Structures are given as structure tokens and as C-alpha cells.
Structure 1
Amino acid sequence: MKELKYDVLIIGGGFAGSSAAYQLSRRGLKILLVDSKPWNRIGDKPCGDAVSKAHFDKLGMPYPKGEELENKINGIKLYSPDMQTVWTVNGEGFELNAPLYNQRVLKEAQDRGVEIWDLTTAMKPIFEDGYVKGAVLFNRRTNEELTVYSKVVVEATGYSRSFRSKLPPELPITEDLDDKDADVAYREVLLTKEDIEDHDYLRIFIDQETSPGGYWWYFPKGKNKVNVGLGIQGGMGYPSIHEYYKKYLDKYAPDVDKSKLLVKGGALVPTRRPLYTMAWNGIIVIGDSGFTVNPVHGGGKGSAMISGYCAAKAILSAFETGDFSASGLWDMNICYVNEYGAKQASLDIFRRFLQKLSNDDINYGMKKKIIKEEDLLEASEKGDLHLSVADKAMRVISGLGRPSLLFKLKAVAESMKKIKELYLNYPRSPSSLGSWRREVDNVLTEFNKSLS
């Protein structure tokens, strides 16, 4: 079999892999990115397509333009289950044509020196003497099986986790997730019969009956075009998401023309803290494969880009030291936990609480202003729920005359702070990963028990 020598092999070309490729480009490295999809479909996984402008501003990722930017977003309207209370949170973002933008990032990375093979699947790892050393690839364009050696593999395969899952199970880089730590989500893009009101605002509808463990959304892509969908928690035995969608669509999108559909589809999305380590010998894991998604709102394209940024940084350092061991690549973890992962861990706790609340709880808490809109934003963006804000919340609901999980909010805030602190003390070397992981697991185990 043909053998080729590369510095870096990136497996997957979605927002995570493409970000890694772009950030590593123009540096004189020999880089190959592969994706199983044909070029014109790369980036087309089902998504709401909404991403904060701040991510592009912080990471130096190409700004969306032309047909790539479908609609400018100025904020989100969050609806209570009874739709009687709407919270508005302001913030600039983009409703993107995801495949078009993703493909442009890849084409620019390619112009900047990255080699790209589409219709090419990494079939199995090359794993020797404890290191990932590359991959066996099947290129369906040229109909060739190829062995590619690399100093580092960037595993960016999305939820499939289709490369790292083939490594020896004792390695921390093969970590799986609980079925209840992901949602299944489904969306369609449709034209509307009536102009969309406040089309610069996304709509998110909380409802435990119509989207248990997730939410419904209505994300305008123009004055007369909308991405509408829902997510529901996995591992709970819920019926087909397609059936939830059909049953409740009219509640959230009475205005759509069901004869003018542009796209439809679903996929899984992780909703938890990141992989305990995103680095091991010869390999870094990013994006959905590394569980980079915000656990409370389900947004993962921004954090995918952050993970690509951190991967590129760690890889450049490893080429300086010549050390591609877990320790040599460990900055991946330090960078990612600082930039997003510690917040994710806090939000993993908060999500578990929110998923257990009843519609009556959410209606009451929103109507009574249990927390401010700005407090919700602080939780979403920093992962902080200050003990103070918790105290005010408890005073607000002190008149509630029935049993409610809402009264546990102070304890939830305490657990959030505790896990955030553990993440701010992320292990400085692989030798401490195990004991730290057990501490985190214990916090989660105890927290789960507190809600049962």
C-alpha cells in the first residue's frame, strides 16, 4: 500500500476541522485534511446555523460574506412554555449558509497550503508503541487505499467519533458519553407566507412537553425564510423526534409554507463538559468529537472554532519541542479549558437542573423574574451563577405554595462554582488526569443524586 508522510492529518472538515486547517496554514507545515463528503456537501450537517459574531472577532476566522451571510442577528427572544413571558437577550451574530462558509474556509486554507481530499474516509488509526502515527485512508475519488503518516492527527469527525473510537479502549482519548448527555435535534428551512416579525431576533421556545430536555427554535434566515427545529434529550425513551416535529410545528411556525421546503434533517449533538482530555500521544480531538458544545444552549459551531484554534496552538508548540506525547500536546487542554471548557463544565451542571424543571416551574420563574435577563446571559457566557443572584431568586419564589425543584437553585449555583473551580485547576500534566477526573465524576454523581 502507498505510504505518504505529512506533518499533520486532520480528519473531518466541518467547523472544527476547517478551523484547525485555517489556523495552521501559511506556516510551512505539510498538512492534509480529509472528509468523507464530496466537496459541495462539506459543512452540511443539520444545524440551526446561528453563530455569535464574537467568535469570529476573537479567533481571527474569516468574516462571513455574500451568500454566506443569510441574516444579521441582534439578539434572542426566549419564550416561556405558556408563551406569556418573553425574555430578550441582545447580542450580535450571524445566520449563516453553513456549507458555503465552511467550504470557503477550506478553499482558503487550501490556497494557503493545506491539501484537501474529499470523498475520503479515515478507516483506521495507525497506532504503534502507544502513539497515534497516522491513518489508513480510503479515497473514493481515486479509488485508492493510502497510508498517511503524521506527527499529529486532529480528530474532527463530529459526533461520529469515527477515528478515536477505534483506538484501544483503555486510553482516555476514547472516552464515550452517556446517552443522556446528548440531544437529538431536527430542523427544516422553509419559506414563510407572512413577513417575519423582528427578523433580526432568533426565537427559542422552552417547553418540556413539546421538546423534552431541549427546546424548539425559529431562527430567521431572512424576512421570509426560517430555520425551524427542536432538540430533545437522548436516553429517555422519547418517541421519534420527527413525530414531535410534525405534531407541534404549527405551534411555533404557523406562518411557514410547508410546500416550500429548502432543506430538512437531523443529527445528534453532545450537551456536556468536554472530553476529559482532548490530547493524547500523537492526537488531538476537537469539535463535537471532543464534546465542545455549550450544554445549556446547544451551540457548538463557535466552540468548535475555539477548539480548532487551541489545537493549532498546541500543534505549533509541539513542533517547537519535538514532543508529540500527551504532555507535549497538553496545552490543547489548558487553552481549551481556559477559553470555553471550564464554562462548559459549569453549564453541564446547570443543564441537568433545567432539564428537570416542569413547565409550571419555568412559567413561574420567568413570569416572576426569578433572575434577570442579564443574569441568564452571564450564566450562558461565563458559566457563572453568583450565590448572590441565587439568594435573590430564592426570595422571589418564597411565596410558591407547591413542591418545586426551583428551591434547589442555591445548591445548583454552589455545584456550578465547585465544578468551575475544579476546571480552573485542570491537571498540568497527564499524570494527574485520573485523580482529577474522579473528583469531577464525584461532583456530578452527587449532583445527580441531589435532583432525584
Structure 2
Amino acid sequence: MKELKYDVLIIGGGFAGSSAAYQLSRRGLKILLVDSKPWNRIGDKPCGDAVSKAHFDKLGMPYPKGEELENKINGIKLYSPDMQTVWTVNGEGFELNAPLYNQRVLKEAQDRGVEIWDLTTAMKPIFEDGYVKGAVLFNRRTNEELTVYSKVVVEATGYSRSFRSKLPPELPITEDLDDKDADVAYREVLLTKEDIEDHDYLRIFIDQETSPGGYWWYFPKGKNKVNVGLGIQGGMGYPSIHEYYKKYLDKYAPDVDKSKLLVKGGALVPTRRPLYTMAWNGIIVIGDSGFTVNPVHGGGKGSAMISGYCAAKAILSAFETGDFSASGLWDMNICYVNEYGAKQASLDIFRRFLQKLSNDDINYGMKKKIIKEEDLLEASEKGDLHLSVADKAMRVISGLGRPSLLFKLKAVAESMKKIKELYLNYPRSPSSLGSWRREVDNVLTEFNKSLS
């Protein structure tokens, strides 16, 4: 078959891959990005479509504008299971037309010299002399099977991890997802019969009964249009997510016009610390494929962008040292762990605690303001549940006279602090990965057993 040579091959053009392509562009490298979807569909994986302004500001990424921005967001209303307590957390964000925004990023990368092939699937890794060296591609548009050699593959295939999963199982880069370390999530976008009240606020409903291990949401995309959905924890033996959706839609969105459903669909959402390494010989993994999603709230588009930025920085470094080994690309890990990954680890711990609380516990915690709105935001945005905050909460939790997981909150805050420090001491070279990964697994297993 035809053979071509590129500096970098990016597989997948979602928020992650498009960010890597945009960040890598005009820097002296010959870059190809492929995606299985046609151009007009790239970026259309089911999603709530809500992204913090802070993630854009973190990277100085351009804001969505015009048709890309469906609705400006000014905060979130968090509802207790019993619906009796509502927290308002202020904070700026965007309700996107994700395909339009994603497609703009790709088009700008393309304008800056990135080559893009839509309707093109990476089918088989080229793995030779112990390195990823490219991919066999199938271009549906030309009916051509092609070999593309690359010094670095950026694996951005989303939740399918379709390319890295084909590599030798020996490689750290083939790390799999445990069923309990992901949610399945499902959403619909519908027009509403009435104008949406406070249409600039997202609504999140916590209820361990109607969305076990996740939550329900109501994300307005305009005055009369809403993205409504839920996520539930995987690996727990729960019934189909669409059963919960059908049963409880009316509770959360009594105002939707079912005759005006616009889109619907679901997908897997990783909810854990990132891949232990996001780099190996000839390859970096980003976005959902590298488990970059916030484990507490399930937001992954901002972290996908961050991972793409770190991949760009790492790759430029590798070309400046002629070194495409894991060691040569290792800055990917250092960059990502400092920007988001250490936070994700702390939040992976926090999520495990939250998923085991009862509705009674959550009703109590929210009613009693055991932590403040701002503290919960700090946990989300920084991965930090300060020990002083945990101490204050424990003083309130001390007044409860029934058994409750809430009594472990200080212990949870301590483990969150420990794992965060462990991640910020990420190994400086691959020869220390094993030792460190064992320390992390030990922290996690200890923590898991401390919750019973």
C-alpha cells in the first residue's frame, strides 16, 4: 500500500485531538489529523455541552462566539435529593454548539498548515522495534488503505480507546478502565413549552435513587431549549440508564416538549485519575482515551483541551531533543499532572466517598451547610478540600446521632491531600513509574477499605 511520512499523526479530532492540532500548528512540524466522522459531524459525541470559562482562560483558548455559543452560563444550582435545599454556585461558562466550535478549532488548525482527513479510521498501529511508529489508515472518501509513519502518534480516540487498545498488552499505555471507574451517561436536547426560569443557570440534581453514582442535569441552551440528562456509575449491576431516564424525566424536566426532541444519545464517561502514564515510546494519549475527565462532576471537554496543550508542549520538546522514547515525551506527564492530573487524583478519592453517601446523608449535609458553596467549588476547581474546611464540617457532623459515612469526611480530606502530594511528586523518568504506580494503588486500596 501507499506509504506517507508525517512528523505527528493525531488520531481523533474531538476537543482533545483538535486542541493538540491547534497547539502544535505553525511550529515547524508536518502534522496529520484523522477522524472517522465526516467533517460536518466531528465533535458530535453526546455531551451536556457545558464548559467553564476558566478552562478556556487557563490555556488562553479563544472563547466560543456567534453560532458556537448557544447560551452564556453564570452559575449552577445544586439540588439536594429531597429538593428542599438549593445551592447557588456562581461562575462563568458556555453552553456550546460543540460540533460548530470543534469544527472551528480544526479549520483554524488547518488554515495554519495542519492536514486533516475526515472519514478516515486508524485501523492498526505500526508497532516496530518496540515503538509506535504510525498507523494503517482507511480513508473511506478515497477507498484507500494507507500506511502513515510518524515520530509521534497522538491517540485522541475518545472513550473507545480504539487505537491504543490494539497495542501489545505489555505496554503501560494500554492501561484499561475498570467498570466502576466510569459512568454511562445519556442526554436529550428538547425545546420547552415555557420559557426557562433562570436560563443562565445550569441545574444539577443529586439523588442516589434516580441517578445512582452520578446525577441528573438540566442545562439550558437558550430561553426555550434544554440539554437534559443523567449519568450513573458503571459496574454496579444497575438497569439500563434509559430506564432511569424514562422513569424520572418528568421530575427534573416537567416543562419539556416531547414532540420537539432535537437530538438524543449516550456514551461512556471515564471518572478517575488519568492514565498512569499518558506517554510511551512513540505515543501520547489524551482526552477521554487517557481518562482526562473530572471524576466528581464528569466534565471532560476543558481537561481534554488541557491534555492537548500538554501533548503539543511535550512533542515540541521531543523534536528539539530528537528523542521520541517515553523519556523523550515524558514532559507530557509532568505538564498534565501539574495542570489537571493531580487534581483528578484527589477528586477520584472524593468521588468514591460521594458515591457511597445515602440520600439522607446528602440532604443533611446540604441542609446543615456542612461545607459552603465556595468550598465545594474549590474541591471541583482545585482538587482541594482543605483540612480546616473538613474540621468545620466534622463539628456539624458530630451532632448527628445515627451511623453515617459522613463521619469519614476528615479521613477523606486527608487521603485527598496525600494522593495529591503523591501526584505532584510524579516520577521524573519512566524507570520510576512502577514504584510510583504501586504507591498510588496502595493509597487507593487503603482508602477503599477505609470506607467500610
> In 2, are the aligned partners of 1:7 and 1:29 still within 8 Å (CA)?
yes
> In 2, are the aligned partners of 1:136 and 1:148 still within 8 Å (CA)?
yes
What is the TM-score with the length of structure 2 in the denominator?
0.99
* 3-state secondary structure, aligned to 1:273: coil
**Cα deviation, residue 386, structure 1:** 1.3
Q: How high is the sequence identity, in percent, across the aligned residues?
A: 100
**Cα deviation, residue 141, structure 1:** 0.6
* 3-state secondary structure, aligned to 1:94: strand
Equivalent position of 2:44 in the other structure: 44
Equivalent position of 2:429 in the other structure: 429
CA distance in 2, matches of 1:374, 1:60: 24
What do residues 299-337 of structure 1 show as CA deviations (whole Å, max 9, x unaligned)? 000000000000000001111000000000000000000
- Which consecutive segments of 4 or more residues in structure 1 shift more than 3 A? none
**Cα deviation, residue 281, structure 1:** 0.4
**Cα deviation, residue 450, structure 1:** 1.0
**Cα deviation, residue 108, structure 1:** 1.0
CA distance in 2, matches of 1:397, 1:281: 49
> In 2, are the aligned partners of 1:9 and 1:31 still within 8 Å (CA)?
yes
CA distance in 2, matches of 1:241, 1:58: 34
CA distance in 2, matches of 1:28, 1:326: 22
What is the TM-score with the length of structure 1 in the denominator?
0.99
> In 2, are the aligned partners of 1:25 and 1:112 still within 8 Å (CA)?
yes
Equivalent position of 2:218 in the other structure: 218
What do residues 173-222 of structure 1 show as CA deviations (whole Å, max 9, x unaligned)? 00001100000000000001111111111000000000000000000000
* 3-state secondary structure, aligned to 1:100: helix
What do residues 73-92 of structure 1 show as CA deviations (whole Å, max 9, x unaligned)? 01011000001101111111
> In 2, are the aligned partners of 1:19 and 1:308 still within 8 Å (CA)?
yes
**Cα deviation, residue 358, structure 1:** 0.3
What do residues 129-159 of structure 1 show as CA deviations (whole Å, max 9, x unaligned)? 1110000000101000000000000000001
CA distance in 1, matches of 2:125, 2:421: 35
**Cα deviation, residue 448, structure 1:** 0.6
Aligned residues: 452
Gaps of 5+ in 2: none
* 3-state secondary structure, aligned to 1:93: strand
Gaps of 5+ in 1: none
* 3-state secondary structure, aligned to 1:419: helix
What do residues 352-410 of structure 1 show as CA deviations (whole Å, max 9, x unaligned)? 00000000000000000010111101111111111111111111122212110000001
> In 2, are the aligned partners of 1:70 and 1:222 still within 8 Å (CA)?
yes
> More displaced, 51-60 or 365-374?
51-60
* 3-state secondary structure, aligned to 1:317: helix
**Cα deviation, residue 62, structure 1:** 2.5
**Cα deviation, residue 28, structure 1:** 2.6
Equivalent position of 2:323 in the other structure: 323
Equivalent position of 2:379 in the other structure: 379
What do residues 256-315 of structure 1 show as CA deviations (whole Å, max 9, x unaligned)? 000001110000000000000000000000000000000000000000000000000000
CA distance in 2, matches of 1:177, 1:11: 20
CA distance in 1, matches of 2:397, 2:133: 57
> More displaced, 53-62 or 180-189?
53-62
CA distance in 1, matches of 2:138, 2:228: 36
What do residues 17-63 of structure 1 show as CA deviations (whole Å, max 9, x unaligned)? 00000001112311100001111110000000000112212213222
CA distance in 1, matches of 2:326, 2:397: 48
> More displaced, 154-163 or 385-394?
385-394
CA distance in 2, matches of 1:133, 1:400: 59
CA distance in 1, matches of 2:377, 2:57: 19
> In 2, are the aligned partners of 1:19 and 1:61 still within 8 Å (CA)?
no
CA distance in 1, matches of 2:28, 2:342: 33
> In 2, are the aligned partners of 1:62 and 1:105 still within 8 Å (CA)?
no
CA distance in 2, matches of 1:288, 1:60: 22
CA RMSD of aligned residues (A): 0.6
* 3-state secondary structure, aligned to 1:410: helix
CA distance in 2, matches of 1:403, 1:104: 53
